[PDB]
Structures are given as C-alpha cells and as structure tokens.
Amino acid sequence: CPAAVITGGARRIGHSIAVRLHQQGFRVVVHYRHSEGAAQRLVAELNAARAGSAVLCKGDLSLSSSLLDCCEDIIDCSFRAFGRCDVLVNNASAYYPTPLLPPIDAQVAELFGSNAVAPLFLIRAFARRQSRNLSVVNLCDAMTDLPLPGFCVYTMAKHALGGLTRAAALELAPRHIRVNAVAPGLSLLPPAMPQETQEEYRRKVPLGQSEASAAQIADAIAFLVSKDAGYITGTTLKVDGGLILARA
Amino acid sequence: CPAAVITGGARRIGHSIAVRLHQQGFRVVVHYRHSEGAAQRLVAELNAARAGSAVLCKGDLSLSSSLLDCCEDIIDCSFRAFGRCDVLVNNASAYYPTPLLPPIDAQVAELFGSNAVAPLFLIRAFARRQSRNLSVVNLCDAMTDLPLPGFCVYTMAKHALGGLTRAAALELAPRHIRVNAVAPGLSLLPPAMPQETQEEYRRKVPLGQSEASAAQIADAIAFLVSKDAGYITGTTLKVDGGLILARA
Amino acid sequence: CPAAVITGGARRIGHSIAVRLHQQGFRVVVHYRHSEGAAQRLVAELNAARAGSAVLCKGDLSLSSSLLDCCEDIIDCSFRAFGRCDVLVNNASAYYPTPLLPPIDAQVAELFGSNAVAPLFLIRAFARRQSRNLSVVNLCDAMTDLPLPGFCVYTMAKHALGGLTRAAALELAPRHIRVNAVAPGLSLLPPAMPQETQEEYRRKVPLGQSEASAAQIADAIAFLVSKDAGYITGTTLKVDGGLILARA
Amino acid sequence: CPAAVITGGARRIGHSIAVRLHQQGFRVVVHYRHSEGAAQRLVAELNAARAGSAVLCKGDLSLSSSLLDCCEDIIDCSFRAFGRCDVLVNNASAYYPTPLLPPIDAQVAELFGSNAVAPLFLIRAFARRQSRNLSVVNLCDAMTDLPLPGFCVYTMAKHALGGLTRAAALELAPRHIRVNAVAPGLSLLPPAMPQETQEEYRRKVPLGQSEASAAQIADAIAFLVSKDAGYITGTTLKVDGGLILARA
Ligand SMILES: NC(=O)c1ccc[n+]([C@@H]2O[C@H](COP(=O)([O-])OP(=O)(O)OC[C@H]3O[C@@H](n4cnc5c(N)ncnc54)[C@H](OP(=O)(O)O)[C@@H]3O)[C@@H](O)[C@H]2O)c1
Ligand SMILES: NC(=O)c1ccc[n+]([C@@H]2O[C@H](COP(=O)([O-])OP(=O)(O)OC[C@H]3O[C@@H](n4cnc5c(N)ncnc54)[C@H](OP(=O)(O)O)[C@@H]3O)[C@@H](O)[C@H]2O)c1
Ligand SMILES: NC(=O)c1ccc[n+]([C@@H]2O[C@H](COP(=O)([O-])OP(=O)(O)OC[C@H]3O[C@@H](n4cnc5c(N)ncnc54)[C@H](OP(=O)(O)O)[C@@H]3O)[C@@H](O)[C@H]2O)c1
Ligand SMILES: NC(=O)c1ccc[n+]([C@@H]2O[C@H](COP(=O)([O-])OP(=O)(O)OC[C@H]3O[C@@H](n4cnc5c(N)ncnc54)[C@H](OP(=O)(O)O)[C@@H]3O)[C@@H](O)[C@H]2O)c1
Numbered sequence: 006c007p008a009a010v011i012t013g014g015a016r017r018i019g020h021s022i023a024v025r026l027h028q029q030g031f032r033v034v035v036h037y038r039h040s041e042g043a044a045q046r047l048v049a050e051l052n053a054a055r056a057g058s059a060v061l062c063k064g065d066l067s068l069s070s071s072l073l074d075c076c077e078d079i080i081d082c083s084f085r086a087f088g089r090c091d092v093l094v095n096n097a098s099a100y101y102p103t104p105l106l107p108p109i110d111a112q113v114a115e116l117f118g119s120n121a122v123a124p125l126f127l128i129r130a131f132a133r134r135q136s137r138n139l140s141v142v143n144l145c146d147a148m149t150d151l152p153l154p155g156f157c158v159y160t161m162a163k164h165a166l167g168g169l170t171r172a173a174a175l176e177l178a179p180r181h182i183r184v185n186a187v188a189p190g191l192s193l194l195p196p197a198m199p200q201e202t203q204e205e206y207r208r209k210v211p212l213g214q215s216e217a218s219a220a221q222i223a224d225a226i227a228f229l230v231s232k233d234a235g236y237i238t239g240t241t242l243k244v245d246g247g248l249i250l251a252r253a
Numbered sequence: 254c255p256a257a258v259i260t261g262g263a264r265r266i267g268h269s270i271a272v273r274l275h276q277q278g279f280r281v282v283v284h285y286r287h288s289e290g291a292a293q294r295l296v297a298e299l300n301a302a303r304a305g306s307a308v309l310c311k312g313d314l315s316l317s318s319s320l321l322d323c324c325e326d327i328i329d330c331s332f333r334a335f336g337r338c339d340v341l342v343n344n345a346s347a348y349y350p351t352p353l354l355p356p357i358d359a360q361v362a363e364l365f366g367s368n369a370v371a372p373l374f375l376i377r378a379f380a381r382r383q384s385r386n387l388s389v390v391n392l393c394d395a396m397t398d399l400p401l402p403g404f405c406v407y408t409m410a411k412h413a414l415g416g417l418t419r420a421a422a423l424e425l426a427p428r429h430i431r432v433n434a435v436a437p438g439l440s441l442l443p444p445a446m447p448q449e450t451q452e453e454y455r456r457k458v459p460l461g462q463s464e465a466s467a468a469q470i471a472d473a474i475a476f477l478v479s480k481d482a483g484y485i486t487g488t489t490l491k492v493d494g495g496l497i498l499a500r501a
Numbered sequence: 502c503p504a505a506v507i508t509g510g511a512r513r514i515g516h517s518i519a520v521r522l523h524q525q526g527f528r529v530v531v532h533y534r535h536s537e538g539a540a541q542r543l544v545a546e547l548n549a550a551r552a553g554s555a556v557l558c559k560g561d562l563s564l565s566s567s568l569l570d571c572c573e574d575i576i577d578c579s580f581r582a583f584g585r586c587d588v589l590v591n592n593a594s595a596y597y598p599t600p601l602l603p604p605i606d607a608q609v610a611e612l613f614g615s616n617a618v619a620p621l622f623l624i625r626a627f628a629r630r631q632s633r634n635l636s637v638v639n640l641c642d643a644m645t646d647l648p649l650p651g652f653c654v655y656t657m658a659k660h661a662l663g664g665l666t667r668a669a670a671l672e673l674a675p676r677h678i679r680v681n682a683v684a685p686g687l688s689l690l691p692p693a694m695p696q697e698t699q700e701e702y703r704r705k706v707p708l709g710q711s712e713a714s715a716a717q718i719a720d721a722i723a724f725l726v727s728k729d730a731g732y733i734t735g736t737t738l739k740v741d742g743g744l745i746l747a748r749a
Numbered sequence: 750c751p752a753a754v755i756t757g758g759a760r761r762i763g764h765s766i767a768v769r770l771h772q773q774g775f776r777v778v779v780h781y782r783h784s785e786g787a788a789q790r791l792v793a794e795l796n797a798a799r800a801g802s803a804v805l806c807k808g809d810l811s812l813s814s815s816l817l818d819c820c821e822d823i824i825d826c827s828f829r830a831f832g833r834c835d836v837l838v839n840n841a842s843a844y845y846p847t848p849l850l851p852p853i854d855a856q857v858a859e860l861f862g863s864n865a866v867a868p869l870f871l872i873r874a875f876a877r878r879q880s881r882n883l884s885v886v887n888l889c890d891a892m893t894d895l896p897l898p899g900f901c902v903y904t905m906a907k908h909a910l911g912g913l914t915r916a917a918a919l920e921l922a923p924r925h926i927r928v929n930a931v932a933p934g935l936s937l938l939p940p941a942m943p944q945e946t947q948e949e950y951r952r953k954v955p956l957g958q959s960e961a962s963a964a965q966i967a968d969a970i971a972f973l974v975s976k977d978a979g980y981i982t983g984t985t986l987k988v989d990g991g992l993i994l995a996r997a
Contacts, residue, residue: 068812073854105873105920110817113866121905122857129849151748152916160916161865161909168908172896175498176849178459209749211426217484224481233472236465239498240491247487250423252647253705253747316564321606353625353672358569361618369657370609377601399996400668409617412664413657420648420656424601457997499997500895501953671994674955707922713980720977729968732961735991739984746919746983 006058007137008032008087009230010079012066012127013097013119015040017193018144020047021219022094025227027051027058031092034083035061038097060086066097066123068114076126080134092230093131095124095166096144103158113158120162121169128173132182139181140238142229143170145188147245167241174239183238187225190245192217212246254306255385256280256335257478258327260314260375261345261367263288263295265441266392269467270342273475275299275306282331282338283309284345308334314345314371316362324374328382340478341379343372343391343414351406361406368410369417376421380430386483387429390474391418393436395493415489422487431486435473438493440465460494502554503633504528504583505726506575508562508623509593511536513689514640516543517715518590521723523547523554528583532558532575532593556582562593562619564610572622576630588726589627591620591662592640599654609654616658617665624669628678634731635677638722639666641684643741663737670735679734683721686741688713708742750802751881752776752831753974754823756810756871757841757863759784761937762888764791765963766838769971771795771802776831779805780823780841804830810841810867812858820870824878836974837875839868839887839910847902857902864906865913872917876926882979883925886970887914889932891989911985918983927982931969934989935960955991 007030014023015037023033024047033051037044044061051059062082064075083090099115128141149163167186174184191210194203208214225244228234243249256279262271263285271281272295281299285292292309299307310330312323331338347367351360376389397411415434422432439458442451456462473492476482491497504527510519511533520543523529529547533540540557547555558578560571579586595615599608624637645659663682670680687706690699704710721740724730739745752775758767759781767777768791777795781788788805795803806826808819827834843863847856872885893907911930918928935954938947952958969988972978987993 070854105876105917106924107877110814113869117861117866117909121909122861125857125901125905126853129853132849133851148748149912150915151746152912152919153748154920157913157916157920158869161869161912164912165861165865165905165909168893168896168905169901171498171894172901172904173849175459175495175896176898176901178461178495180850181461183460211423212429212431212484212486221484224483225485228476228481233476235472236460236469236494237473237490237492238460239493239495242485242490243488244482244485245487246484247423247426250419250487250647251749252644252649253749318606353628353669354676355629357622357625358566361621365613365618369661370613373609373653373657374605377605380601381603396996397664398667399994400664400671401996402672405621405665405668405672408668409621409661409664413613413617413661416645416648416657416660417653419646420653421601423648424650424653428602498895500892500897501995501997667994671955671991674957674991677956679956707919708925708927708980708982709922717980720979721981724972724977729972730988731968732956732965732990733969733986733988734956735989735994736987738981738986740981741983742980743919743922743983746915 006030006032007091008034008083008089009092009094010034010036010083010090011094011096012036015044015047018219018222019096021223022096022226023047025223026092029227032058032087034086035059036079036097037061037063038065066119068118068122072118072123073126076123077130080127080130084134090131090134091137091139093127093141094226095127095141097123098144100159102155104155105157116158117162120159121165124166125169128169128184132177132180136181138232138235140183140185140230142226143186145186145241147188147190147243147249150249170241171239178238185229185237185239186241187222187229188241188243189217189222190248192222193219209251210246210248211251217244217246254278254280255339256282256331256337257340257342258282258284258331258338259342259344260284263292266467266470267344268295269471270344270474271295273471274340274478277475279340280335281307282334283307284327285309285311286313315366316370320366320371321374324371325378328375328378332382338379338382339385339387341375341389342474343375345371346392348407350403352403353405364406365410368407369413372414373417376432380425380428384429386480388431388433388478389421390477391434393434393489395436395438395491395497398497418489419487426486433477433485433487434489435470435477436489436491437465437470438496440470441467457499458494458496459499465492465494502526502528503587504530504579504585505588505590506530506532506579506586507590507592508532511540511543514715514718515592517719518592518722519543521719522588522726525723527588528554530556530558530579530582532560534559534561534593563614564618568614568619569622572619573626576623576626580630586627586630587633587635589623589637590722591623591637593619594640596655598651600651601653612654613658616655617661620662621665624680628673628676632677634728636679636681636726637669638725639682641682641737643684643686643739643745646745666737667735674734681725681733681735682737683718683725684737684739685713685718686744688718689715705747706742706744707747713740713742750774750776751835752778752827752833753836753838754778754780754827754834755838755840756780759788759791762963762966763840765967766840766970767791769967770836770974773971775836776802778827778830779803781805781807782809811862812866816862816867817870820867821874824871824874828878834875834878835881835883837871837885838970839871839885841867842888844903846899848899849901860902861906864903865909868910869913872928876921876924880925882976884927884929884974885917886973887930889930889985891932891934891987891993894993914985915983922982929973929981929983930985931966931973932985932987933961933966934992936966937963953992953995955995957990961988961990
C-alpha cells in the first residue's frame with residue numbers, strides 16, 4: 006500500500022484530502038502545527054478503519070534556520086511509519102493581509118514558508134529519498150491572477166508555488182515523479198465570517214452560487230494522484246466554478 | 254441512461270473516448286466524415302455489447318452555408334436516437350500547414366470550421382435544446398502557445414476554441430452546463446509518419462519520452478465529464494507529460 | 502519615408518494611430534468601410550500638412566468569397582500610393598453580442614472576418630510583398646480573458662487574433678517582420694451610451710477611474726512600431742489601467 | 750527633475766538603465782553590492798555630465814534580519830540626495846543553479862531576497878514615502894514559463910516577482926503609482942561563458958539570432974517610465990525576439 010504525506014491535513018481541505026486518499030488505500034501522514042487535537046482525532050478515526058494506516062507529524066513550515074531539517078523529517082516520517090512515500094500534498098498554507106500602506110518579516114517568514122519554501126524543501130527531500138506512481142500535488146489559488154488588495158505577500162508566495170509546480174515537474178520528469186497543482190477558487194470560508202458575508206461571497210460563483218466543498222477539492226486531488234493522470238505533470242487544475250471568468 | 258456526442262469519434266482519440274464513455278453507461282452518437290468503415294465497425298461493436306446504445310452520423314464541419322444546419326442535425330441526432338443529449342465532445346479536427354510564404358480561404362473554412370465554428374454551433378444547439386450532469390469537453394492543443402511554424406490557421410482556430418471554452422463556460426453556468434477542455438501535447442502520431450521521425454518526436458517528451466495514448470487522453474475527458482468534476486467549468490486540462498515546459 | 506496601413510482608421514482609436522504615425526513621418530493609408538466622410542476629412546488634413554502623405558482605401562473585412570482579394574488590394578494600395586508598405590496596424594473590428602441562448606453565421610462572417618481572418622490575409626499579403634523596420638501591430642482586447650457575457654463570437658475572434666500575433670511573430674522572424682499587439686482594457690466608449698452608464702464603466706478602472714483616451718492607446722502602438730522596440734516581437738502590450746486585475 | 754533608483758545598476762543591464770534614465774533628465778541612485786569600482790565610475794561619469802545628478806548606495810538584498818532596514822535606506826537615499834523618488838527599478842538579481850537532485854537555505858536567501866523580497870520591501874518603502882509620474886519597473890524573465898532545469902529557486906523567485914508586479918499595481922493604483930515589468934528573454938550572456946556556448950544560445954533567438962543588448966532592454970524600461978505609458982500599470986512587457994515561442 007502506497008504512503009501519502011498531507012501538510013496541514015488536520016482540518017478543512019487538508020482533512021478532506023487525507024480522508025479521500027485513505028479511502029483509496031493510501032497510508033496518509035497527517036502533518037500539522039497548531040491543530041494537535043484535530044490531527045489526533047483524524048489519525049484515530051482512520052486507524053480505526055485500518056490499523057496502522059495513519060500517523061501524525063508536527064512541524065512549523067515558516068522560514069527559519071530549522072525549516073530545512075523539519076521538512077526532511079516530515080518526509081522521513083512517512084518512511085518510518087510506512088517504509089515509503091508515494092504522494093506529497095502541499096496543502097498547508099498561511100493566509101492573511103500584508104497591506105503595503107499602513108511584524109512584517111514574521112509575516113514574510115510564515116507566508117512564504119508555508120506556501121512556497123517548505124513545499125520546495127519537501128519536494129526536494131521527497132525526490133532524493135526515492136514501478137509505482139509517485140506524484141506531488143500543490144494547493145494553489147485560482148484567484149491570484151486577480152490579486153486581492155492587501156494580500157501582496159500571500160499572492161507572491163502562491164505565484165512562487167506555481168513556478169515551483171512547473172520547474173519541479175520538468176526537472177523530475179526523468180525520475181518518474183509527476184508534479185501538479187489544484188487551484189480552488191472560492192472554497193471553505195473562514196468559520197468566524199458572518200453568514201451575511203459568506204452569502205455575499207457564495208453568490209459570486211457563476212456555477213451554483215456556492216463555494217467548492219472540501220470533498221470537491223479532494224476529488225480533483227484524488228484524480229491527479231491516480232493512474233488516470235499518469236501522463237499529467239506540470240499542470241494546474243482549476244476548480245473555481247467559473248469564478249475567475251467574472252468581471253468586476 | 255445519458256447520451257454523449259463524440260465528433261470525429263470513428264478512430265484514434267475520438268474512438269477511445271466514445272468507447273470509454275460507453276463503458277461508463279453512456280449512449281453514444283459517433284460522428285464522422287470519411288471514416289465510414291471504422292464508424293460502422295465501432296457503432297456495431299458498441300451495439301453488440303449493448304442493444305441500441307450507439308448510432309452514427311456523417312458530416313462535414315468546414316465553414317459553409319450548410320454548417321449551421323449540419324451541427325443542429327448532429328445534436329438532433331442524439332435526441333432522436335436517445336431522446337436526450339448530456340455530453341458533447343468536440344474532438345473533430347482538421348490539421349495541416351498553411352505557410353504564410355510560398356487554396357487558403359478553403360483551408361480557413363475547413364481549419365476554422367472543424368476546430369472552432371462547428372464547436373460553437375454544436376454547443377449552441379446543445380444548450381438551446383436542454384437534474385443531471387450536462388457538460389461539454391473541447392479538445393484543445395497544449396502546444397499552441399508555441400506555434401508550430403507553418404500552422405498559422407490551425408493555431409488561430411485552436412486559440413478560438415480556448416476562447417469558446419471560457420466564454421461558453423461562464424455564459425452557460427446559470428444553465429448548469431459545464432464547459433471544459435483537454436489539451437494534449439504529443440499524442441497519437443500520424444500513421445504515415447516514419448518510425449525514425451516518430452522516435453524523434455517521442456524523445457522530446459520529458460515524462461517517459463513517449464506520446465500520450467488515446468486512453469490517457471480519454472481518461473481526462475472521462476474525469477471532466479464525471480461527477481468528480483461537478484464544480485469544474487471553464488478549465489483546460491493539460492495532458493502533455495511536461496512537453497510545453499521544455500525550451501528549444 | 503515609410504508607409505503604414507491602418508484598417509478602420511477613419512475614427513476613434515484608428516484615427517488617433519493614423520495621425521500619430523503620420524506625425525512621426527509615416528505616409529499613411531487610411532482604410533475604412535462605412536465612414537468615408539470621416540476618412541476623407543482625415544486624409545485631407547494629413548495631406549494639408551504634407552502633400553501626398555495620405556490616401557484612403559475602402560473595403561469590407563467580413564468573411565466572403567471576396568475577402569482574400571480585398572485584403573490583397575488594401576496592401577496593394579500602400580504600394581501604389583507610396584511604392585512600399587512598412588507598417589500594418591490591424592485595428593478594424595466588428596463588436597456586438599451573439600448570445601448562445603435566445604443571423605448567426607453572418608455575425609460569424611463579420612466578427613471573425615474583421616477581427617481574425619482579415620488580419621491573417623493582410624499579414625500574409627504584407628509579408629509576401631516585401632534594411633528598414635517592418636512590423637505589424639494587432640489591436641487586441643485585454644478583457645477577453647474575462648469573456649463579456651453574450652459576446653462569445655467576438656471573444657473567440659479576438660483569441661484567434663492573439664494566436665495569429667504569436668504564430669506570425671515566430672514564422673516571420675526570419676523575414677525580420679515583427680508582429681505585436683496592443684490590448685486596451687476600457688477605452689473609447691460607444692458614442693450613444695448614456696453618460697450614466699459610461700460613468701459606471703469608468704469608475705471600474707483602478708488607475709484614475711477613467712477609460713483610456715485614443716492617444717494613450719496610440720502611444721503604445723507608436724512604441725511597438727518604433728526602433729525602441731526593435732527586439733520586440735510576438736508580444737502583446739496590455740494598456741488597461743489595471744482593469745483586468747480587479748475581482749467581481 | 751525626477752529621481753530614480755536602480756538596484757544592481759553598476760554593470761550590464763542595470764548600468765544601461767541608469768544611464769538611459771539619466772539621459773532623460775532623471776536623477777539616478779546607483780545601488781550595488783559588490784561592484785564598488787564600477788558604481789563609483791558610473792556615478793562620476795554621470796555627475797561629470799551634470800553636477801549632483803548621481804549618487805550610489807551599497808546594500809545586500811539577500812533575506813536577513815537587516816533586509817527590511819537596508820531596503821528602507823535605499824529608498825531613503827534618493828530622498829537624502831534629491832529630496833524625492835519618482836522611479837524604482839528592481840533590476841538587482843542573483844541567478845545560479847539549485848538542482849533538486851544531487852548551502853540551500855542560504856541560496857534561497859540570496860535568490861528570493863534579490864528577486865522578490867527586497868523588491869517587495871523596496872516598493873513598500875517607496876510607496877509609503879510619497880502631479881508627477883510615479884512608477885516601478887521590475888526586471889522579470891520571459892523564459893521562466895519554460896523552467897530552465899536546475900534553476901528551481903531562481904524560477905520560483907521570478908514568479909513571485911510577477912505576482913508582486915500585479916498585486917502592487919492594483920493596490921497602488923489609487924495612490925497613482927504604476928507598477929510594471931520588463932521581461933528579457935536572452936540578453937547579456939555570462940562574461941565567462943565560452944563563445945562557442947554563447948553562439949549556441951544566440952542561434953536560438955528567432956529574431957536575428959542575437960541576444961538583446963542592454964540598450965534594447967533599457968528602451969523598454971524608458972518607455973514604461975515615460976508619459977507614453979501613463980495608462981499602463983500591472984503589465985509585463987516581454988522583450989525576447991520571439992524566443993519564448995519556439996518549440997524544443
Ligand atoms: N479555503 C479556500 O477558499 C481556498 C481557496 C483557494 C485556495 N485555497 C488553498 O487551498 C489550500 C487549503 O485551504 P484551507 O482553507 O483548508 O487552509 P487553511 O484552513 O487556511 O489551513 C492551512 C493549514 O495549514 C497549516 N499552516 C498554516 N501556516 C503554517 C505554518 N507556518 N507552518 C505549518 N503549518 C501551517 C495550518 O495547520 P494547523 O491548524 O495545524 O496550524 C492550517 O490549518 C491552501 O493552500 C489554500 O491556500 C483555499
Ligand atoms: N494526436 C495528437 O498528437 C494531438 C496533439 C494535440 C491535440 N490533439 C487534438 O486532439 C483531437 C484528436 O486528435 P486526433 O489525432 O485523433 O485527430 P485526427 O486523427 O486528426 O482526427 C480528427 C478527426 O476529425 C474529423 N475531421 C477532420 N476534418 C474534418 C472536417 N473538415 N469536418 C468534419 N470532420 C473532420 C475526421 O473524421 P474522419 O476520419 O471521419 O474523416 C478525423 O477522424 C483533435 O482536436 C486534435 O487537434 C491531438
Ligand atoms: N474602445 C474600447 O474600449 C476598446 C477596448 C478594448 C479593445 N478595443 C479594440 O481596439 C480597436 C479599436 O477600438 P475602437 O473602439 O476604435 O473600434 P470601433 O470604433 O469599433 O471601430 C472599428 C472600425 O473598424 C471598421 N469595421 C467594423 N466592422 C468592419 C467590417 N466588418 N469590415 C471592415 N471594417 C469594419 C469600422 O469602419 P467604418 O467606420 O469605416 O465602418 C470602424 O470604424 C478594436 O480592434 C477593438 O477591438 C477597443
Ligand atoms: N542577462 C540576461 O540574459 C537576462 C535574461 C532574462 C532576465 N534578466 C533579468 O534582467 C535583470 C538584469 O540582468 P543582468 O544580467 O544584468 O544581471 P546580473 O548581471 O546577473 O546582475 C545582477 C546584479 O544585481 C546585484 N545582485 C545580485 N544578487 C544580489 C544580492 N543578493 N544582493 C544585492 N545585489 C545583488 C549584483 O550587483 P553587484 O555586482 O554590485 O554585487 C549584480 O551585478 C535581472 O533582474 C535578470 O534576472 C537577464
């Protein structure tokens with residue numbers, strides 16, 4: 006049975022992805038940073054259906070002198086628990102404003118680290134430790150071509166992640182490792198956001214006036230790691246219900 | 254059971270797609286132009302497997318005074334044979350050089366008709382004649398961004414098809430019809446091409462140094478039509494083994 | 502002195518380009534279809550500043566059996582008047598809705614003809630009839646990525662023109678003919694449109710809440726035809742005040 | 750007289766850009782890190798032509814605890830020597846391999862700092878310290894869509910810069926600051942590269958089989974800072990001689 010690492014897999018989209026891949030035979034590594042309780046409950050729920058089919062792994066993905074080693078360990082964790090690592094899902098991601106006009110480098114460290122630099126180090130480590138079906142799926146953002154005002158640093162990071170998806174896809178093709186991305190448009194809203202506001206956002210979606218559910222995002226991810234996407238590498242699969250096509 | 258129309262579905266990619274959707278319970282209308290034999294052998298094979306599950310339809314898709322009605326009849330052929338039409342696959346495509354420097358308007362009529370205008374009329378007829386899962390999949394070309402020298406017209410047509418995919422996607426969103434596309438890189442080579450030449454082409458693909466099989470392309474189309482892509486509309490799915498990433 | 506052909510140069514943007522190039526020393530061929538009077542007033546004004554520096558030319562660019570020859574004559578017009586043709590500016594364009602749901606092929610003929618096919622035949626003739634600084638500038642649309650609901654055919658046509666800009670750029674490079682494009686976002690509004698509606702459009706522009714003047718667009722074209730863009734080919738220059746960057 | 754800041758302006762492209770803006774009346778800050786001799790000679794050359802029209806500023810743009818402060822001083826320099834800053838050219842850039850398969854974070858610090866994070870901190874400072882004509886121009890890379898194997902981190906950083914170009918453009922529009930980019934394809938080759946190798950690279954450029962000269966790149970930047978681009982913001986101007994258009 007193939008093993009999969011899911012960053013930020015304790016809740017929301019990452020959680021849904023960890024469950025989908027597990028439902029498909031995958032022995033899923035549930036990485037987290039602050040959501041220990043949720044990660045613990047997930048690993049228990051999964052291992053309940055299948056003994057030793059899940060383990061958790063804690064690690065801060067923000068930029069720092071320890072990041073590199075942490076990423077090596079996150080990957081090494083999959084090998085200790087399952088003796089292999091077939092899939093890596095870079096889902097973990099910080100998201101908040103960094104307005105240009107009125108601490109910053111701490112925001113830079115967290116935004117750039119989780120969205121771009123960690124995935125890089127993780128992909129790198131994942132590759133050097135490697136037939137079967139090896140692949141990486143990066144979680145992008147279909148709306149970054151339309152930069153949300155005040156989110157410059159996050160936007161930059163996601164663009165860097167996009168560049169990493171293509172650079173790694175080409176460089177790793179010879180190693181039989183596919184590298185793709187799933188770019189949601191509007192998906193799980195912030196739980197604290199007022200319903201009125203959530204509704205205003207849902208109505209903007211051309212297809213169904215609704216955000217993508219975590220399961221619909223996981224549908225796309227399951228496909229890219231499946232055999233049905235065996236010739237697919239370097240592609241970013243948009244799942245936005247046509248949101249990016251609408252004009253202001 | 255649902256019904257799907259596959260233009261140019263008598264052989265190669267279009268054949269693999271008709272077979273695939275049929276294997277998933279679809280009733281198929283196999284359109285063709287000159288591949289009368291294959292069209293017949295396929296429609297019979299499918300009917301052998303399932304009585305009254307496949308019909309055929311002959312037609313030219315080049316620009317002309319009779320194109321509009323031809324497309325209406327192709328779609329109408331699905332409603333007559335099965336009383337319904339849920340999926341439309343725009344696979345039919347003319348492909349050949351049109352060098353700017355040493356008949357042109359005839360080439361423009363055939364290249365643009367098959368690759369863009371016909372798909373336009375087809376989607377139009379399809380949408381006007383329409384819960385279920387209605388979707389359209391256009392067959393694009395991942396390499397049209399790197400214009401093959403001498404294929405100016407073909408390239409313009411495919412580009413028009415991409416605009417069609419997104420324009421229709423948004424416009425038909427309220428009608429619950431999803432419009433997406435699959436963009437192969439190097440797939441089935443011309444049967445007349447010498448092996449030496451075919452091998453020079455295959456070797457350029459980063460992932461495995463091989464062209465995409467028809468089944469691998471059929472895989473992406475099947476995914477975009479499946480329920481696993483219910484939130485996807487207006488997206489082009491590249492299936493090129495990283496080909497578009499390599500520099501000359 | 503170099504000669505330039507400006508399609509649809511009788512009024513608005515095309516008129517401003519014509520004048521701008523003339524002011525830079527170009528001998529111009531003001532082409533029109535129905536605005537003979539505006540064309541004549543322009544050609545008259547230009548020749549008053551420099552004798553024999555401007556001639557007008559009439560022709561319909563819609564698809565028809567006469568299109569190929571008409572485009573040939575438009576280019577042949579530059580050579581008859583000035584004995585040369587150094588610059589081609591594809592600005593003439595048909596623009597109106599073509600909703601998918603409640604004559605079409607005549608709309609296709611006009612929208613595809615003026616926006617895509619005529620430019621292809623004109624570039625073809627221009628290239629075949631050829632150191633200096635030879636270049637072509639296609640007038641695109643920055644918002645065609647966010648398809649305006651109900652303008653499917655127009656959008657497809659402009660995409661085709663984009664595909665042409667690049668295919669021609671690469672294929673004509675060995676002939677030292679550069680092919681580029683300018684893509685306005687919101688420029689000259691319809692003269693009939695109510696000031697209320699015009700103002701609602703203006704306020705959407707992030708940079709100044711104003712549409713682009715004909716001159717500003719002229720500035721971009723002038724730059725692309727100049728020596729200052731001698732290494733530029735196959736590029737599309739966006740001029741939208743950041744309009745394409747805003748979210749709905 | 751407006752004042753401009755040019756990072757990495759001591760040699761090659763940055764040197765040519767500084768000279769070009771200076772010729773247009775611009776008071777140009779020449780930033781450098783290691784090329785003290787060169788920077789000193791350029792400023793002397795410039796002042797010699799116009800007393801007090803040039804000054805230099807030293808600063809490492811790699812990621813570090815000092816970067817934020819350093820970038821602030823770079824912008825501050827323009828205000829100290831000219832009491833104003835109208836133009837920022839983010840030209841400084843590290844470029845070298847970081848292969849995925851056989852110190853890394855130190856490479857990430859140098860590659861991401863110079864190409865993406867410093868520009869971010871510089872634009873941030875620049876905007877906070879501000880009619881006239883304010884604009885930023887980022888030096889991008891037209892080929893980063895075709896990731897050069899082995900240059901992953903450099904590629905990711907340039908992608909982040911492209912993201913910055915668009916996010917900043919939209920966010921600073923209300924403040925009247927235009928943010929654009931110039932993307933060279935093949936320009937000045939490494940001085941130590943053998944001619945044979947240099948020739949191989951040159952022959953790949955479709956337009957003239959030659960790399961772009963620093964002056965041709967400088968031309969594009971001079972246009973984007975000029976009044977002739979007053980409506981232009983958020984656009985990346987490719988200057989590649991058609992290179993990005995050729996298939997492998
Ligand atoms: N939700 C949407 O609408 C939407 C739309 C487009 C794209 N996306 C993208 O889709 C993916 C999933 O979105 P989501 O909404 O589920 O994400 P999210 O809820 O924002 O969660 C990201 C998770 O990753 C972890 N994380 C964040 N910063 C980290 C850091 N510095 N170090 C280590 N872990 C860190 C956190 O885990 P802990 O809780 O364990 O700290 C956090 O729960 C993301 O990459 C996102 O950008 C989401
Ligand atoms: N093969 C590749 O490597 C590759 C790469 C990128 C994209 N694609 C795209 O993928 C799709 C399938 O590729 P393919 O290689 O299978 O295509 P293909 O073999 O060229 O088949 C095109 C089919 O469409 C029909 N057709 C051609 N011209 C027509 C016209 N004027 N009017 C009506 N029907 C016409 C033909 O039917 P009859 O045989 O019945 O005459 C033919 O079977 C195409 O849209 C193509 O552009 C293919
Ligand atoms: N205005 C904007 O906001 C905007 C925004 C984005 C892009 N654009 C693009 O910028 C360019 C110039 O815009 P514009 O507003 O000045 O255009 P426009 O006013 O619509 O003018 C198009 C001109 O082309 C000619 N024309 C139209 N249909 C024709 C046909 N079938 N055959 C031959 N000639 C035909 C007309 O000439 P006669 O008057 O002689 O009949 C007309 O003057 C166009 O290519 C447009 O797509 C404009
Ligand atoms: N040359 C090409 O073919 C080409 C092609 C595409 C894009 N470009 C882009 O065009 C721009 C100019 O290219 P170029 O070839 O002239 O550049 P380059 O010679 O590579 O020089 C970059 C300059 O920036 C400075 N620099 C590098 N790393 C730095 C760091 N960590 N901190 C502070 N300064 C640093 C250096 O200044 P000191 O010497 O003072 O240390 C160096 O001279 C770049 O942004 C480049 O990416 C160039």
